Symmetry: D2
Subunit: 248 residues, 4 copies
């Protein structure tokens, strides 16, 4: 029987490349999405064309609220309903925007940034464990200790996620569930970003003066879920071309 | 004129010793508390007996919610209302209890553990900076954040987020002359509801003296970070753990 | 043409497992050894028996001394002499024994513990880079470097230095397309001098399976780092420790 | 009786300020020096003018060699000879220069850079602890250890080794009541050799004030750690970097 994976925010960019590479490895995939219905569906049809009945989609908002635990439970439940098992959880979905200290209310920013980056991964982890080569892979950030100016909530969420990865690895090890992170430095830059600002970041990267492809990020996820990683838990693998090593 | 400090969860235990030492150093103090009303008032009484009009209490629930921004604004506002200034913020208040992955709802556990340990400190930092000498913030972190207690994921998540806040806020507020630092206990005053057997188990693990830090030892490190002897320290987290975090399994 | 790799201390245990797996991946291999001549020649025989002219041995002491740079240069030269290229360097060889602060002279212990774990890796890295596609270096580190064993200060100093080299060399050799990474075991193959009981005590502290890593499990992570699947990875140290580093005292 | 302290490389710059501040706090001091005889004696004169027979100088090369262990044993002995006790050791002396991977032989650079930054502090630590069975050791580390200067592999290896020594020694010496901590400057007094324009490039990177730390700001952190206010603190490394290490490329 083919194993199954849930990948959150899988419609586009890194999460898409993760879903694709997992599918190519032989995984059936639950493609979670929030706003990107058309892209999520186009991905599912592409993958089902490859092998029928191997891809489904799951819509949920991952903002923190009093319904988020039920939403996260439902996303895990969807994988079991589609595929009768859930072997891999990838916490990829992420809100990302500045929140300076000095039109969204602040409580909404907290809900979105802490919810997507930290609380939803925690609830999903809970649901995943309660329902049981099992592992969870969290998309972290190589630059968590050298954060972007005015990104306190985002950075707090990514720091929290490190704590989740470590705490869950310890707690779930007896159940044989491994929990690891992949930490991009600069990968796919925002779509709006002018090439000239993209280049300011690219130039900082020691290995090649370029950003990671989504596929390069996905390669590290693939390693962490594979049988080549079966003693690996609580580890966060930077995929950053040495960017985090560069002083000011 | 005397500087003023806000200390959250300052009615008992470590927050209280921090409040007292700040007061002995010359600070007027806002004693924030949540449930410990009697203890809060008793401390203000004590401190005001020593120097009149140098201590006030301020009640707030620091659980995460849509009104938490208002509560945090009001804590900082109460420092200005009492003392005309706010020089020091100490983020001490914290919920601490297990939340295993396998009688409160999970929603409530998220709100309390993430609210008190991370979100309220962020909002307090925001309100503090916006109302702005030697200005600084001290966050009560955890020396064991990368070697966490089993089944404490939400607690450990909040303390990890707090590290991120300390670093992010240090960077962003440095242009305003506001320093932001941490003090990270290993084992200090042990939980009231911890059994004496577990207490002694923790004590035996500490290389330096086989005992927990007194509240006053933790407070001493807070005092250093807010002092003139720390004017170039920002984004630093000082472990006060007697070497506990260095001890392998 | 098949790529070529140098593995230090490759005669036995983890070094052998990396050498074997690299060879199974299609590398030709320089099996470096110090005292274990028979085991190193036995491995080379086995590997050549699988594919003719794909393995050679190379004897060298990696203790620090004024000729260590010539020795390390010679190890790289040996790979080029045998195979006409050198694609991968794995720094595995390591002295490991206690050096309490309170029959070897202390200067010999420094030379052996710092030489094998840090200086030789640095000299080999220099020689490797100077002689230069998927070029990389992998350094066998220690997951427990921040939670060290009692009385192993020089060994721990050496492994910490190795972390700095990993990061320093990743930064400086990135323009040359040489990636530099580490793999950090927790407990893998226990020391042969360790009795089963002391072995079991270590085994029992591992959250993931309560067992040590097989030599193969360590080799799997080396194989990933040198692969095309890790082409953007440099300066990273991958723990392969079953959660051991996360477990508090 | 007044306590006594050893400060290595104490003739100038940061080591000088540490020595002055320790003396002002009431310590008698051993001023160690290698080349700076004139300056070491000048500081001695100034301190002894303040309180008679409270400062002595001590000459040693701290480069790694066969005689280094004897040299370090003698630095510690000089403190006992002068003052009948040795309460504090500050490992400040340091060689600092590039050693690109791709003048001095490389083994001489290993000897100086790893010797001064790591091996000498290890040997001094041994000699300090042995003569015992508020004692502490403070090591001068580097806030930028994980974001090193380009082409400074050996230096960076030495400072990483020093972090390892700090933690290993804290663990091993805790049962003796000897605390072991570090202070990690970012940019303080810029190297005299450094060009003026490059000095200003570094200053402008510092979030807190866009300036370097004075030597006295570094010393302030040393003073805290050796004080009774840091009595539960061991294995801690306090950054004094004005946020510098927080700033991304
Ligand atoms: N790209 C980089 O340079 C970089 C660098 C460091 C770390 N990372 C991390 O790597 C991961 C992938 O990065 P990325 O650039 O591919 O991410 P991204 O495009 O910025 O976001 C990924 C997806 O997250 C989902 N999302 C946002 N808000 C949500 C909400 N409220 N509820 C549910 N889903 C929500 C979105 O789904 P919909 O489109 O369906 O609405 C989005 O497509 C992220 O975790 C990120 O933090 C990336
Ligand atoms: N004690 C240790 O060994 C240790 C170890 C590591 C880290 N720390 C950290 O050091 C700090 C002080 O430790 P501690 O043991 O003194 O803390 P504590 O007694 O467990 O908590 C301090 C105060 O936090 C307040 N608090 C809890 N929930 C709150 C809420 N929902 N809203 C507002 N306030 C709330 C409580 O105030 P009221 O009583 O008024 O209700 C409580 O007295 C904490 O941040 C802790 O995480 C302590
Ligand atoms: N075993 C574990 O649980 C564990 C845990 C953490 C890290 N590690 C790291 O992983 C790596 C492999 O571990 P291991 O247990 O397989 O190592 P090991 O058996 O203790 O040592 C591997 C080889 O190092 C070589 N070596 C020792 N001194 C040397 C010298 N002066 N000059 C040249 N070579 C010398 C020896 O070669 P000869 O036999 O030919 O003389 C030895 O076979 C090491 O770097 C180790 O520090 C292992
Ligand atoms: N200044 C900074 O921005 C900065 C930044 C990060 C870390 N640090 C650390 O803080 C400490 C003080 O820095 P600094 O700039 O004051 O240091 P420094 O001037 O570069 O060196 C201090 C002293 O070290 C002694 N020294 C050098 N080589 C020696 C050897 N082979 N044997 C014995 N002594 C030797 C010298 O003594 P003699 O003059 O008597 O020959 C020198 O005056 C150092 O450990 C340094 O790495 C400083
Ligand atoms: C301080 O360095 C960085 C650089 C990029 C990022 C980064 N994080 C992101 N998270 C999401 N969800 N989407 C993104 O595009 C990014 C991103 C970038 N670029 C974070 C820290
Ligand atoms: C894994 O080691 C520890 C030990 C103690 C603690 C700890 N955190 C606390 N937070 C609050 N608010 N109150 C406490 O008593 C503690 C506590 C302890 N003990 C955390 C991690
Ligand atoms: C604190 O946990 C550990 C456990 C094992 C080791 C360890 N390091 C070694 N290095 C060499 N060269 N050979 C070994 O066998 C080990 C070893 C073990 N076990 C170090 C720290
Ligand atoms: C990457 O940022 C830095 C900044 C300063 C230093 C630094 N290290 C030193 N060591 C000695 N012995 N003397 C020095 O002046 C410095 C120094 C500087 N500046 C190192 C790394």
């Amino acid at each position: 029987e083919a194993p199954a994976a849930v990948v959150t925010g899988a419609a586009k960019r890194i999460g898409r490349a993760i879903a694709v590479k997992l599918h190519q490895t032989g995984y059936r995939v639950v493609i979670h999405y929030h706003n990107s219905a058309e892209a999520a569906v186009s991905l599912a049809d592409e993958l089902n064309k490859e092998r029928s009945n191997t891809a489904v989609v799951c819509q949920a908002d991952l903002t923190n609220s009093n319904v988020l635990p039920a939403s996260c439970e439902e996303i895990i439940n969807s994988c079991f309903r589609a595929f009768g098992r859930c072997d891999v959880l990838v916490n990829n979905a992420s809100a990302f925007y500045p929140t300076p200290l000095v039109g969204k209310t602040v409580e909404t920013q907290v809900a979105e940034l802490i919810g997507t980056n930290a609380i939803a991964p925690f609830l999903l982890t809970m649901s995943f464990a309660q329902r049981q080569n099992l592992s969870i892979v969290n998309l972290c950030d190589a630059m968590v200790d050298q954060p972007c100016m005015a990104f306190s909530l985002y950075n707090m969420g990514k720091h929290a996620l490190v704590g989740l990865t470590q705490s869950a690895a310890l707690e779930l090890a007896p159940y044989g569930i491994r929990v690891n992170g992949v930490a991009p430095g600069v990968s796919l830059l925002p779509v709006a970003m002018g090439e000239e600002e993209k280049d300011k970041w690219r130039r900082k990267v020691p290995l090649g003066r370029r950003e990671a492809s989504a596929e390069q990020i996905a390669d590290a996820v693939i390693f962490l879920v594979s049988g080549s990683a079966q003693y690996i838990t609580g580890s966060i693998i930077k995929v950053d071309g040495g960017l985090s090593l560069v002083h000011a």
